[PDB]
Amino acid sequence: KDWTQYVNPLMGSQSTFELSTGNTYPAIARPWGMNFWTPQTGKMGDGWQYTYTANKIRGFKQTHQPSPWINDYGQFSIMPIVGQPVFDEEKRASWFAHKGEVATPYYYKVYLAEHDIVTEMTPTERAVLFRFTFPENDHSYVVVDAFDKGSYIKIIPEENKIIGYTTRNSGGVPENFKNYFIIEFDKPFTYKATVENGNLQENVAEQTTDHAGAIIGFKTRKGEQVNARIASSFISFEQAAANMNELGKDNIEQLAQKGKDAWNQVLGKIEVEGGNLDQYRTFYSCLYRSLLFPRKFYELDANGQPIHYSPYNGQVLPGYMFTDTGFWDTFRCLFPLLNLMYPSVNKEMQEGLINTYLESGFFPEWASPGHRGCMVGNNSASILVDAYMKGVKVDDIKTLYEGLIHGTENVHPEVSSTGRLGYEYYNKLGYVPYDVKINENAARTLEYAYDDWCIYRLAKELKRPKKEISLFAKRAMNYKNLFDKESKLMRGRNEDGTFQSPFSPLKWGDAFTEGNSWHYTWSVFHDPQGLIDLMGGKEMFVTMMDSVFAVPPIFDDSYYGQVIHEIREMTVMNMGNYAHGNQPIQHMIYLYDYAGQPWKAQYWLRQVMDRMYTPGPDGYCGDEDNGQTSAWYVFSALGFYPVCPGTDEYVMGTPLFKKATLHFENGNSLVIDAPNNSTENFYIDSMSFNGADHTKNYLRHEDLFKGGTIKVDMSNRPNLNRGTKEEDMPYSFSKE
């Protein structure tokens, strides 16, 4: 039963700086793999390491890059060639075409047209097997590139082996950071050379220099295959060698099979039927993208116990560690998805977070590998609390709570996105002022508020002191401090307490991050009713939502000076100011449920799923962002979305398929039957849950886990009476 056939790793690779259609590369990897491998079309150092329209491949690279914007670390490449032994990354490059390329999560193949060589790779979590099919030539070589900024290489002929380490990175690493790699060939070298800053040196065994490389070679018969076993570690050569054992004695075929099995095992936890081939492809591609980040950053020791290099303090320590995710993106639904279908995995991740705190002093917000300065918010709180509240509990709860509290009153000395920048003002005034030299104050305030709700939630659960509990309950209401009654919008506010003037609701950035007031105003995940109230009741609230879609996509970019890609992405979709291409607004359509008009959510949700996602190389409508934008589709296609992580609630949308089945780790299954689904029939007329009638606009975690059947009768006309009753509404803090 194979779902991998639907996965297109090229989806999102046809992106450019001006317009993102995903900004992804073909991550050939195991789920959450420590090391990813990709064909490399971009020049060394370029965030866009693989682009669909590129003509040439210049290497097969080990990568850890989460985003072109964030860039890479622990990176080196290998490239087979023929003819002259050349190290230069342009001269070694080869034309190829996509019709001569086969990309799957577990297997990658391509024909290098200028060398007449076929390259195949199959990876494990930490290692990979390459098989090079050479033409007949007296001069066949393999180039190993350690990249620049200080690297090391060494050839061991008596073991047909090349070892080295690479260090080029993009920040967020300890001074001693290194990636140690080992490469074993099954064919003896007739030619060997190391490379030292572009210089080829035959028979010099070893280089320690800015940019080390190696070239080995031999005579090849037509069709002769040479295999290279490769692995790496962030710990040591000894450890890299241990990692190499993941390959066993397997060949390309056997490893591919194991990787396929591995992926089907996770993709198969969600079976969908009764859709068209585009939908299958969009859906599983998205699911695959949701099982990559954060990556494992731990390695197995002699006793099979997890240990890790600390990207926070550079020691090697026992226990789990993961990295390469930005919580500002992924708290929204990516991690919620893990808690629903892959809690065993998130348990490891959560334990990793505890270690991050122990080793770093803070919980991370953006980590690649270590703390990096990107985005805003203290959403690690949502990640941590949502997990706990959903049954994924770390062993050290004392430490968890302390960590949470620590982050409310500290900001990292060098990485301002770690901890709460502006906490002094926030704690004192109730908001982060628009005029105190802290940017994106309004976005910070709104998210901090939701964060504090999460802390309140956990604190209550821990039966902490009333004074504590009350303090966060109070701070959860801070979003009110930025609400402008006249505009009905969230708005920047001065320290002196006056709202900021001139006010441009359509201006991006400044008070907000990559969105304007019309996008950020909806960021009250824990208290939609509270928001509804400030706007003057649900009717006015719905009017307000509706105009998001109804107005042209006009904008003010003065804060950026140029039409950044996320603005352009909005303009072209012709859906008003609904910028689905970016994270802040992604939950918004579901808010219709809270105002007693679920049918409007049903209508627009189906719009988005039909129009904003296609299965091709230009498949997404904005940055994919480490699973967030993909998992949005995954949830939404199933029919529900975790608007407010930290509750046990998935707010109801509309299911895309005629049947979906979930297999939870607990052994139960849940079937969602929508036999009458169609392109036309995207309204929910009625719903029953194991035979009971279900008029609510949400489902509960514990209920889903019990399994059974949900029936959804789809219709082509909205049902104006379902889900308008007050007990149908999802959670709002104000109602508590």
Ligand X SMILES: O[C@H]1[C@H]2[C@H](O)CCCN2C[C@H]1O
Report the residue number whose CB is nearest to ligand X. 326
Residue 621 half-sphere exposure toward CB, CA atoms < 13 A: 24
Main-chain phi, psi angles of 105, to 5 degrees: -60, -35
- Residue 158 neighbours by CB under 8 Å, 6+ apart: none
| Degrees, nearest 5: CA angle 406-412-417 | 100
Is 193 among the residues that bind ligand X (CB under 6 A)? no
Which residues from 513-532 bind ligand X, rule CB under 6 A? Answer: 514
Report the residue number whose CB is nearest to Ca ion. 623
Beta bridge partners of residue 216, listed in sequence order: 142, 192
Question: Which residue, 326 or 639, is less far from ligand X as judged by CB?
Answer: 326
Is 382 among the residues that bind ligand X (CB under 6 A)? no
Distances (CA, A) of 320 to 267, 299, 538: 24, 9, 46
Residue 375 interface partner, choices Ca ion, ligand X, none, CB cut-off 5-8 Å depending on type: ligand X
Tell me if 672 sits within 8 A of 721, measured CB to CB. no
**Ordered DSSP codes for 110-173:** EEETTTTEEEEEEE-SSEEEEEEE--SEEEEEEEEE--SSSEEEEEEGGGTEEEEEE---SS--
Closest approach of ligand X to the CB of residue 369, in Å: 15
d(CA 296, CA 321): 6
Among the listed ranges 64-72, 379-387, 441-449, 570-578, the one in contact with ligand X (CB under 6 A) is: 64-72
Closest approach of ligand X to the CB of residue 625, in Å: 4
- Cα 538 vs. chain centroid, distance in angstroms? 34
Tell me if 346 sits within 8 A of 399, measured CB to CB. no
Q: Does the annotation place 315 within a ligand binding site?
A: no
Is 120 among the residues that bind ligand X (CB under 6 A)? no
- Tell me how many helices (H) and strands (E) the chain has: 18, 37
* DSSP code for 268: T
Q: Does the annotation place 33 within a ligand binding site?
A: no
Q: Does the annotation place 581 within a ligand binding site?
A: yes
Of positions 209, 517, 582, 602, contacts ligand X by CB under 6 A: 582
State the DSSP H helix or E strand holding residue 307, giving kind and residue range, or none if neither: strand 306-309
Of positions 348, 625, 648, 649, contacts ligand X by CB under 6 A: 625
Among the listed ranges 42-50, 67-75, 268-276, 600-608, the one in contact with ligand X (CB under 6 A) is: 67-75
Residue 328 interface partner, choices ligand X, Ca ion, none, CB cut-off 5-8 Å depending on type: ligand X
Interface residues toward Ca ion, by CB under 5 A: 623, 625
Which residue type occupies 22? G
Is 451 among the residues that bind ligand X (CB under 6 A)? no
Residues touching ligand X: how many (CB under 6 A)? Answer: 13
Is 367 among the residues that bind ligand X (CB under 6 A)? no
What is the SS3 assignment for 15-79?
Answer: CCCCCCCCCCCCCECCCCCCCEEEEECCCCCCCCCCCCCCCEECEEEEECCCCCCCCCCCCEEEE
Residue 664 interface partner, choices ligand X, Ca ion, none, CB cut-off 5-8 Å depending on type: none
Closest approach of ligand X to the CB of residue 23, in Å: 8
Of positions 196, 246, 618, 623, contacts ligand X by CB under 6 A: 623
Q: Does the annotation place 625 within a ligand binding site?
A: yes
d(CA 359, CA 306): 16
Is 70 among the residues that bind ligand X (CB under 6 A)? yes
Closest approach of ligand X to the CB of residue 541, in Å: 26
Site string for ligand X, 299-328 (x = CB under 6 A): ---------------------------x-x
- Residue 126 neighbours by CB under 8 Å, 6+ apart: 33, 34, 35, 231, 232, 233, 243, 246, 299
Question: Which residue, 336 or 730, is less far from ligand X as judged by CB?
Answer: 336
Is 72 among the residues that bind ligand X (CB under 6 A)? no
Closest approach of Ca ion to the CB of residue 566, in Å: 6
Strands 108-112 and 117-123: antiparallel
d(CA 236, CA 181): 9
Question: Which residue, 320 or 335, is less far from Ca ion as judged by CB?
Answer: 335
Question: Which residue, 125 or 329, is less far from ligand X as judged by CB?
Answer: 329
Closest approach of ligand X to the CB of residue 29, in Å: 19
Residue 81, number of CB atoms within 10 A of its CB = 26
Question: Which residue, 67 or 382, is less far from ligand X as judged by CB?
Answer: 67
Question: Which residue, 269 or 565, is less far from ligand X as judged by CB?
Answer: 565
What is the three-class DSSP state of 493? Answer: strand
Question: Which residue, 330 or 636, is less far from ligand X as judged by CB?
Answer: 330
Residue 471 interface partner, choices Ca ion, ligand X, none, CB cut-off 5-8 Å depending on type: none
Residue 385 interface partner, choices ligand X, Ca ion, none, CB cut-off 5-8 Å depending on type: none
Beta bridge partners of residue 367, listed in sequence order: 325, 371
Is 341 among the residues that bind ligand X (CB under 6 A)? no
d(CA 528, CA 713): 27
Of positions 15, 67, 94, 133, contacts ligand X by CB under 6 A: 67
Say how many Å lie between the first and final Cα of the chain, rounded.
46
Closest approach of ligand X to the CB of residue 150, in Å: 26
Question: Which residue, 124 or 630, is less far from ligand X as judged by CB?
Answer: 630
Is 583 among the residues that bind ligand X (CB under 6 A)? yes
Which residues from 386-425 bind ligand X, rule CB under 6 A? Answer: none
Q: Does the annotation place 492 within a ligand binding site?
A: no
d(CA 241, CA 249): 14
Residue 440 interface partner, choices Ca ion, ligand X, none, CB cut-off 5-8 Å depending on type: none
Closest approach of Ca ion to the CB of residue 514, in Å: 7
Q: Does the annotation place 514 within a ligand binding site?
A: yes
Tell me if 640 sits within 8 A of 689, measured CB to CB. no
Q: Which residues are annotated as a binding site for Ca(2+)?
A: 329, 514, 581-583, 625
Binding site for ligand X (CB under 6 A): 67, 69-70, 326, 328-329, 374-375, 514, 582-583, 623, 625
